[PDB]
Design a protein around this ligand. Structure first.
Ligand SMILES: *[C@@H]1O[C@H](CO)[C@@H](O[C@@H]2O[C@H](CO)[C@@H](O)[C@H](O)[C@H]2NC(C)=O)[C@H](O)[C@H]1NC(C)=O
Ligand SMILES: *[C@@H]1O[C@H](CO)[C@@H](O[C@@H]2O[C@H](CO)[C@@H](O)[C@H](O)[C@H]2NC(C)=O)[C@H](O)[C@H]1NC(C)=O
Ligand SMILES: O=c1c(O)c(-c2ccc(O)c(O)c2)oc2cc(O)cc(O)c12
Ligand SMILES: O=c1c(O)c(-c2ccc(O)c(O)c2)oc2cc(O)cc(O)c12
Ligand SMILES: *[C@@H]1O[C@H](CO)[C@@H](O)[C@H](O)[C@H]1NC(C)=O
Ligand SMILES: *[C@@H]1O[C@H](CO)[C@@H](O)[C@H](O)[C@H]1NC(C)=O
Ligand SMILES: *[C@@H]1O[C@H](CO)[C@@H](O)[C@H](O)[C@H]1NC(C)=O
Ligand SMILES: *[C@@H]1O[C@H](CO)[C@@H](O)[C@H](O)[C@H]1NC(C)=O
Ligand SMILES: *[C@@H]1O[C@H](CO)[C@@H](O)[C@H](O)[C@H]1NC(C)=O
Ligand SMILES: *[C@@H]1O[C@H](CO)[C@@H](O)[C@H](O)[C@H]1NC(C)=O
Ligand SMILES: *[C@@H]1O[C@H](CO)[C@@H](O)[C@H](O)[C@H]1NC(C)=O
Ligand SMILES: [Cu+2]
Ligand SMILES: [Cu+2]
Lengths: 343, 344
């Protein structure tokens, strides 16, 4: 029919959805949510959503936990503060700016606050279907012009109502007090934020944060150069059974055949920088730019390559051995965000 | 010949140059410079260059002044700190992250330091031709794969002896400048506004100033779909350097609105920051630009542009006082959001 769709399909199929497409949009006060990948569109594998919002002096949501969902916060642009705490571990907070990442495993108390005027948060939540919460809390938005968001109490449900959302896997943590001793975008002191390497948490269940470019990286040289920066591996996902990362890409040299991939689990990516061509199943090849999302059903063959000299995508895969993990296993440890200057 | 080029042309003509094209690449230590618009390519109107670099614990250049060039620093991605001081005024510094902007007029002392691993600075320097300095001090880079910078603590670039010798290049050393070290939350001195509130352009020419992404003044133009101009340099600050600089954010063009043709006295250019923008210049094919791609339009050449993405943002520069950004401002209204209205 058409590979490109304006809202996520109501069933599993190859699709691309452009940045700021309608995507069943709702607003929650000033925040505008778009559901690029849903439970029905992914066969319940994962939800990929974008939230665009203006600066707020108040929290963007009351503190809460998910018992059954793993949540991932990625800052596409602008900035937002994220607070997280597992059990009786020290409360952590970071101010995420463009390309920064925050990991929120099951049973981790969290909240966020939108700082900059042009802020966009990409949420990847596993398993899929978590969006039903926003269908309830939000008000449908026609947003005819596709504007990123519509131009101080805490945003969202009040204390009574947030304590009423257990059926959507939201559990209130009303006694949680977000720490107020942030300095240079982090607290407590003696955390590393934009000043040094960030490791993935070695302990399952603990939150962690990776500043843009400061996490572990792997160079794969098999099909041109690709650099995988892991955000979630089997160590962290455990039974939620997924991977999450960015993949950075060179062009494919004309002497290299662009490979054909197929994996048992669904996967998806959102372009962050550059221009990436995707050919999925029997559909025409389509070039994606900033914020565009490609979705590939499990078991469907696909090909992708970068038309830009350098592109970076945020990538999610259902399963323990999707594309990013395959590229890591076929690659080597690498200490740069740039690939070699020679083939 | 063809619209799309791998290095900027050697004479004035319409062209498009893709992000990370060769663009007469040079390195200076760890920094890789690319010259998307040059003096010769713009008829000396302006230079638009991109510098990609990894984190450094040292300054990216020794402190210095330009007497005849106005420098503009825009953070495409990553982050870098910028220091600046004019005459008798207090020394200012900000840590710029994606979409942030720092203005450095003639006769303002300045230096910078690269903070994050994947940092990209776009420099717009007026008038054009300043890039000779980077040819001269730089080392030619072939960069076959077009990698953003070459993978790999003294101050980067010329030593103090060398930088005191570069007057011909309009570089004057300020070796007694001490970059302030009391940065907190990305700014010093403490009594400044950075990512916490509105930023104004300088009240007059000659003074440095900084605009954090989304926090400067904005104007909505509704004549051709919705466009939001966020000025960075106006006639007030440019004076005789005679240019304007801003971002322009764009909606799609509604089917009932004709995409306008423009033809300006002076050369103009833009680099896409977010989104997908089609440009149709002269008799060349409509061409779609993505992140970091640059379009250059000579004065006197007709062109049309529109956004294929639902929202695009470009960094825009024009020679003259009445280029595209100022035209859209004059035809528009003050506006307090980085988003345009939800209805046409
Ligand atoms: C640096 O920025 C942080 C915000 O990230 C400031 O922390 C705030 O401090 C005030 C006053 O103590 C508190 O009431 C707020 O709740 C704090 N915010 C957060 C999120 O921690 C801090 O004041 C700034 N430091 C300086 C010197 O400007
Ligand atoms: C917050 O970040 C700033 C840098 O932006 C740190 O500033 C440095 O502080 C050290 C020790 O005082 C100085 O030696 C450096 O010269 C400073 N750098 C700059 C660029 O000003 C600051 O220490 C950080 N604050 C905290 C409490 O961690
Ligand atoms: O439970 C909630 C939640 O998780 C998130 C969220 C938002 C953006 C993301 O990118 C993300 O990963 C999660 O927002 C909310 C907003 C509300 O008003 C109420 C909620 O209960 C949540
Ligand atoms: O004079 C100089 C200068 O201005 C800049 C510069 C760099 C990036 C920008 O984006 C910009 O606007 C200016 O770098 C330099 C680097 C050197 O090694 C020596 C110099 O003399 C300069
Ligand atoms: C999360 O906490 C709940 C309630 O205490 C517990 O039943 C559950 O096993 C925990 N889940 C995980 C994945 O740790
Ligand atoms: C909001 O949109 C959904 C999805 O189309 C629809 O089911 C629902 O009825 C809408 N709500 C209202 C109140 O119209
Ligand atoms: C993980 O997901 C993959 C792909 O969806 C699937 O093949 C596999 O059965 C899953 N494994 C587990 C342990 O559930
Ligand atoms: C810059 O300083 C030089 C040397 O003092 C002076 O001659 C020149 O006129 C100044 N230019 C401007 C625009 O202020
Ligand atoms: C700055 O201060 C000095 C004296 O310290 C003075 O000579 C100079 O004229 C002042 N600058 C201006 C522009 O007034
Ligand atoms: C050009 O660059 C190379 C390294 O890329 C350097 O060795 C060489 O001297 C430079 N100049 C010439 C004349 O090739
Ligand atoms: C300013 O630039 C415009 C466009 O290039 C040019 O036509 C005009 O002559 C310039 N004005 C002055 C006084 O330099
Ligand atoms: Cu949550
Ligand atoms: Cu300079």
């Amino acid at each position: 029919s058409s590979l490109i769709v304006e809202d996520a399909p109501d069933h599993v199929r190859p699709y691309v959805i452009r940045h700021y497409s309608h995507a069943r949009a709702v607003t929650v006060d000033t925040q505008l949510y778009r559901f690029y990948v849903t439970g029905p569109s992914s066969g319940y594998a994962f939800t990929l959503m974008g939230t665009n919002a203006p600066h707020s002096d108040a929290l963007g949501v009351l503190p809460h936990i998910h018992q059954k969902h793993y949540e991932n916060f990625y800052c596409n642009k602008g900035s937002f503060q994220l607070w997280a705490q597992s059990g009786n571990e020290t409360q952590q907070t970071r101010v995420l700016s463009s390309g920064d990442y925050g990991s929120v495993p099951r049973n981790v108390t969290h909240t966020f606050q939108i700082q900059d005027p042009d802020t966009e948060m990409t949420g990847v939540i596993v398993p899929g279907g978590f969006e039903d919460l926003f269908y309830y809390l939000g008000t449908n938005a026609t947003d005819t012009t596709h504007t990123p968001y519509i131009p101080s109490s805490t945003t969202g449900p009040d204390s009574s109502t947030i304590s009423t959302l257990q059926s959507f896997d939201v559990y209130a943590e009303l006694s949680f007090t977000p720490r107020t001793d942030t300095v240079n975008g982090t607290a407590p002191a003696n955390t590393v934020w934009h000043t040094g390497a960030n490791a993935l948490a070695s302990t399952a269940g603990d939150p962690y944060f990776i500043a843009n470019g400061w996490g572990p990286k792997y160079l794969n040289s098999q099909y041109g150069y690709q650099i995988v920066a892991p955000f979630v591996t089997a160590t962290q996902a455990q039974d939620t059974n997924y991977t999450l990362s960015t993949i950075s890409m060179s062009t494919t040299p004309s002497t290299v055949t662009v490979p054909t991939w197929s994996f048992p689990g669904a996967c998806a990516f959102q372009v962050q920088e550059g221009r990436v061509v995707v050919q999925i199943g029997d559909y025409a090849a389509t070039e994606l730019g900033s914020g565009d999302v490609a979705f590939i059903p499990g078991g469907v063959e696909f090909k992708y390559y970068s038309e830009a000299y350098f592109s970076k995508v945020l990538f999610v895969s259902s399963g323990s051995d999707g594309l990013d993990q395959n590229l890591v296993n076929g690659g080597e440890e690498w200490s740069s965000v740039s690939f070699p200057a020679d083939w």
